[PDB]
Structure formats: structure tokens, C-alpha cells
Symmetry: C9
Subunit: 101 residues, 9 copies
């Protein structure tokens, strides 16, 4: 009850869980080839947030002179940029809540 991702698109291995969730959220007939390309980019981004968040939690534990507040500031911003991009991607595929019921 799913589709398999395009080979050329380059879905990361740990992103598959995310891919399956996105595809199941809209009628299977309604996925075009163009949409499936776009869905790879969405899944990759949803994965990448988990990776950056891990990086950030590490840096926040360090305390004293070693603590890099500049890096902390950057990781915080990169996480918000991804989150907002993901909202745009969802809207583009019409799998945002307004379009689904």
C-alpha cells in the first residue's frame, strides 16, 4: 500500500520511515512522477532536523571557556529554517491538513 522512491532522487536510508508516512497521507493514484521527486526532498529534510537537533544538544551541554555560543546560535537558526521549508513543501504536495479533510 505504498510506492517505492525514485532511484535517481537519492533518498537517504534512514529517511525511509518518513517517506512511507508522507506517501500514505494522500490517495495513491494521485501521486505523479513529479510529485514523487518532490516527496524525496521532503523526507530528507524531515530526517535532517533530527540530526541537527542532536548536534545542538551536545553543544549546549558544554560549559565554561570551551562553550561556543556562536555555533549554538547558528544551529538554532538552521533548525528554524528547515522547519519553515518543510511547511512550504507540505503545502506544495497538498498533504497539509487544509487539503486533507
Amino acid at each position: 500500500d505504498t510506492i517505492d522512491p525514485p532511484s535517481h532522487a537519492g533518498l537517504e536510508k534512514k529517511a525511509e520511515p518518513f517517506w512511507h508516512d508522507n506517501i500514505r497521507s494522500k490517495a495513491l493514484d494521485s501521486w505523479t512522477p513529479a510529485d514523487l521527486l518532490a516527496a524525496v526532498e521532503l523526507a530528507n529534510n524531515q530526517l535532517y532536523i533530527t540530526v541537527l537537533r542532536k548536534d545542538l544538544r551536545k553543544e549546549e551541554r558544554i560549559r565554561g571557556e570551551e562553550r561556543d555560543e556562536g555555533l549554538i546560535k547558528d544551529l538554532r537558526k538552521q533548525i528554524v529554517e528547515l522547519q519553515r521549508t518543510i511547511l512550504a513543501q507540505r503545502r506544495d504536495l497538498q498533504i497539509h491538513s487544509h487539503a486533507t479533510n
Copy 2:
């Protein structure tokens, strides 16, 4: 009564109270798998504001030469950025007041 969060998404442990509140705000049938991924990001952010606010109140108590006005300025900005992101996330899930009232 509620749904359980996706394992791969990475909901932080102290964010569960927030997760439960968000899911209860809209009919259970109307949550898709894509929406549940998005709801993890919302809950994590609602938690993270409480964490930053604690950090800020600490720095504001310090007075004299030790007081870092640059860090105070940054924490204040990061808190507004999160707040505005949360409004966007709510709208995307249709759990903002207009959609529920």
C-alpha cells in the same frame, strides 16, 4: 483518547505534556501520518521556549562586569523567532482558533 508519537520523529521526553494537549484539540480521525510528524516539531518547540526563558532569567540577574548584554540580546531574539514559528506550525495543522471555533 490520544495517539502515540512516531518513534523516528524524536519527541523529547519532557515534551509529552505538550504533545497530548495538541492532539486533543482536533478530531482523532482527522490526524494523518504526515500531520503527526509535523505535530512532533510543534511540541518540541513549545517545550524549547520554556528552556530558553529559564536561560534568559539567569543572565538578567547577573549585574556588574560579568553581565553579558550581547547574550541577553540574542536570547531575547531567539525567543521571538520561536514564538512566530509556533504560530505558523499551528496554522499548518489547522489547530488554530479560526479552524476550531
Copy 3:
């Protein structure tokens, strides 16, 4: 009647007056659990403006070499940013005037009648 704020959300103690005012501005049945979380953030910000304004008035009194014009400039900007964020928060909860009274054009007459009353008096 009112609602009590969520424990986990972390409403600051001196923010309670603000919380009560916001909740009373819309029908109690119409508050969801998601909205109540959002209402804590609104109340905290309405409090925090009063705190920054106090900080600013202090710095503006200082004169001479000690006067920090850079800090004065920053506090002034932070106050406008908060104010604009509060307008967005209000809109999100539908407790801004448009949502609690309707389209602008549908307020025209209501107001006229009041202006009229106010003359008959004088």
C-alpha cells in the same frame, strides 16, 4: 468564571492579571487545550513589556559618560518587536477586535448611534 493555566506551560506569577483578562475576552467553551498553551505565551509577553519599559526609563535618566546610547537603542527596538508579536498572537487566538465584533464595515452604524447619543447628552 475563568480557566486555570496549564502547569507545564510556565505562566509567570505576576502575569496572572493578564491571563485573566485574555481568557474573559471570548466564550469559555471556545478555548481548546491548544489555545490555552498559546495563551500562556501571550500573557508572558504582555508582562515582559512592562519589565523592559522599566529598564529603559532607568537608562534614560543616566547622563554624562555613563550613559549607554547603544543599550538605549536596543531596548527601544526590542519593545517594538514585542508589540508587533503580541498583535500576531492575539489574531491567532481570535481575541482581536475584528473577530469579537466582525468586519470593519459592519461596525459603521453601531458607532454612529453612539456618537449621536453623545451629543444629545451635551
Copy 4:
């Protein structure tokens, strides 16, 4: 549910009831500055008294404080513009000029949010 027709007798009662109570008093916790009261009274009188919610009144304090604060900054600016020679701080002059425009634009947004802009009142 629907609001009373502005035709109704009922409507004309509320209007007369309204103008008897001339104004509302500002929330204590909000922190209206003392010299801002004149501005507060003008804003409240510009729309029907029944139509002010508790949420709106909090927001109206922020509007009044800003309308006052413009007069304060403008005084500061006129002082600096008189100074000439080496003492003249063109950097501060530039900043005061910008802060005044930012406030002005914020005030327009605040008015619209409370529905006391001309479109809603005329």
C-alpha cells in the same frame, strides 16, 4: 445570537446607557504612564463603549504609551539638531529620526487592530 439591529429601540437604549458612562478606567497591571491618560481617554471615546473587551483594553494601553512616547523622542531630536560644531552627533540624529518613523508605523497597525481606524468609524 446575532447582534441587535441598530434600527432597534434596544440599540438606542444601549447608546444612551453608553454615553452616561463616559469612559473606562485603564487596567492597573498594564502600566499606563501618567502623562498618557489624555491619549487613553481620546482613544476609548472613539468607538462604542460596549464594544471594548478586556483584551482590547490591555492592547489600548500599549497604543496610548506609544502615542505619548513619540512626543518625548521628538523633543530629544530637536535638542540634538540645535547643536552644531564638533559636539554634533550625526549618528544619534540618524537614530532618533528612524525610531520616530518606526513608532508611527506601529501606531497605525495598533489602531487597525482595535478597529478605531477611520474605515471602521466613519
Copy 5:
């Protein structure tokens, strides 16, 4: 016939000509107390443009080493910012052409 400006608002003396022109541009009954406050800010800005333009013409006459191109650049920008603000203010009072034509 006209209205008199609020005392506390602080209409500058040389701004009165501008004040009178703005008030005459819409029916006298239709000015509320809130509008009159707002109209002071409009009149002060229409005055202030004339003041800055005088300052600019002075600096543009100076030539050689004394010429301050940085100040010239700033005065030019300040004049455009005022002009754009005045268009917003006009719209807010409904004395822009669309509302009066």
C-alpha cells in the same frame, strides 16, 4: 470651518497650514478624537519633509574636500522614508483620493 488640534499631541507651530489643509479634506463631523491625534502626526511629517529638503540642498552646494557624501546619502534616504509613511497615514485617515473621489 475647521477643528483645533489637541494640546497634548504637540503640533509644531509652522505645521498649522498643513493641519488646516488635511482637516478640510473630509466632512468635519467625521473626525473622531482618535483621528485627530493621528492627524497631528501626519501634519508634522508633511512639515518635516520641507525642513530636510532644505538641509539637503545646503550639503549639495558644498564641493571639494568638505563635501560629505555620507550625509548626502542619508538625507536622501530619510526623505523617501517620510514620503512613504505619509502615503500610509493618508490611507489610514481615509483622506486618500480613492476615498474622497
Copy 6:
């Protein structure tokens, strides 16, 4: 007669009069309010000022060698675009843009 005269206090520059006359003729004379006429002075002054800046820019572009100031050239180019975009907004505000006049 054909036109209106500009408000004295507004400060229409002398060489801007040709522009003023063109703008006023572009909409019915009865339809000009006192508020509009103030706004129309700012429009005319800006339409003049573009011609002045353009002259300044063409001078600097002729200079070549070490004397050539590329920083000033860059600034004059930007100032001219900002004015042009402001003029579009001003026209819209007076309803003398093409959409309103057919």
C-alpha cells in the same frame, strides 16, 4: 482655467512646475482636494529630482582612470531606482495611474 496653483507652504521647486501642470491635467479638476494637492507637490518634486540625479550620474560615468569613483556611481544608480519606485506609489495614491484613468 486649465489648472490649479500649488500650495505656497508645500514648497514646489521652480523647475518642477512643468511636471506639476502635467499631473494636475490628468484627472478632473473638481476631484482635487486640498490633501491631494499637498501630495501632488511631493510627486512633482520627485519627478524633477530624477532629472537632476541622472545628470550627476552621466558626469561621473565620463571620468576614467584613477579619478573614477565606482562607489558613487553605484550609489547614484540605486538612488535613481528608489525614486522611480516611489513615484509609482505616489501616482497610485492620487488615482492618476493608468488603471484608474483608462
Copy 7:
């Protein structure tokens, strides 16, 4: 048949070809005096792009130490800014395709 450009507006001599094209693209009766002023600015800009592009092609030929990558970058940006301004100007005069098709 065409109209002749206003003298005071300052249409550049080599811009006339552009002027003629723009005027012919909409009914002659429908040009007001205000529009003709605006049309001069459009024609001057359409000319000036050709001039900057020539400047850019010169700089791109130079190679070695003499090559100014900073100027190349600036000329590239100035050309895009003009192009986008021209789109706005066209729309304002209602000689864009939507209005004429």
C-alpha cells in the same frame, strides 16, 4: 501615428526607438499627460540596460590580475534590478500583456 515626448522629461536621444515601441502598444487616445511622463522613465531604463550590458561584456574579457570580480558582480546585479523595475513600470501603464491581450 504616435505622440512626441515631453521636453522637460528628458528622454535620451538613443531611447527614441524604445519610446515609439511603447506608445504604439496601446490606444493613442488613452495616453494622459501623466502617463507620458511615466513612459519617458520606462524608455530611458530600457535603453540603459543595453549600455550596462556592454560595460559588463568588456570587463568579462579582461583576465589576470586586472580582472575586477567585484565590478563584474555589481554590473550583474544592477542589470537584474533594472529588469525588475521595468516589469513594474509596464504594469503601471497597463501595457503588459494581460491588459493588451
Copy 8:
């Protein structure tokens, strides 16, 4: 079954898989010559994301003094810029989900 890309447009060789997917997502009669040019730019961008992502994963493996956090920051931003441009391109060709579903 498909169309062949314009020679002058310059579709990169490894982009062909992407090209085929995009063309198949809309009725063949409905592709104009202008659209086909635009579709080359879309395909090239969908390819180029895979290339940048590879570059980024390399830099993220390096640790110690050699690690360039500045380059890591830049690659992360360039990937989001491409992704947002791709959404605009899709909308322009009407092969986004709203137009096809």
C-alpha cells in the same frame, strides 16, 4: 510517450531521468516550446541538489582543526535556496499537485 529536450537549452546528461519524470506529469499536448525551455532549468536544479548534498556529507565527516564550519553553513543554506526555487518552478509549469490533482 515523451518529448526530447531542446539542444540549445543545455540539459546535463545525468539530469535526463528527472526530465522524463517531469514531462510525464502533464498532458503531452500541453507542453509549449516556452515550457520546455523552463523544464530544462527545473531538471538541472533537481539534479544539482543531489550534487551539493554529497559535498555537504563529505565536509560533515571531517573533524578536528581541518573542519570548515563556514563552508558547512554555506552548503546548508545553498541547499534550502535551491529547494525553494524548485517549488516556484513547479508552480510556473502547473505540475504542482494542486494543478494535477
Copy 9:
């Protein structure tokens, strides 16, 4: 004759002609005004210029070691996105975007 010829003064580059012909054919010939043809030259020149910048970029990306200029690489990448976005605006302005033609 199923196309139009470009205005001489507009300055269509020689290698841009293939692009010009494709754009003109994408909309009914009667519907091209003289103003549109000027605008269409700018569109064609930009569609060409992307191919030129992309070639420049691929050269710089091959260089590795100390010679590699990451600053130039960053700039070329940005210039390519700016052009792309401008082209979308130009298409819409001429009504040869898919919505108008489908």
C-alpha cells in the same frame, strides 16, 4: 513565416536566437505587441546567459587544492538563482507561462 524578427535596437545576442524563436512560437502571433517584443528580447538574453554562467561555475568546481576559490563559487551559485527567479517573473509578464497557455 511562422515567427517575428527581433527589434534591432533591443540588442538580442546572436546565440540567443534559438531561445527567441521558441518563446515567440508559444503564443498567437497576432497577440505580440511592439512593447512585448522589447520585453521578449530581455527574456531570451537571460535564458542564454544562464547557460554561460553555468559553464563558468563547472570550471571553478573542478579546481581543487589551494587554487580553489570558494568565494567565487558561492557568488556564481547565487547569480544563477537570481536569474532563474527573474525569468519566472518575465514569463508571467508576457503571459507565456503555463497557466495562461493551458
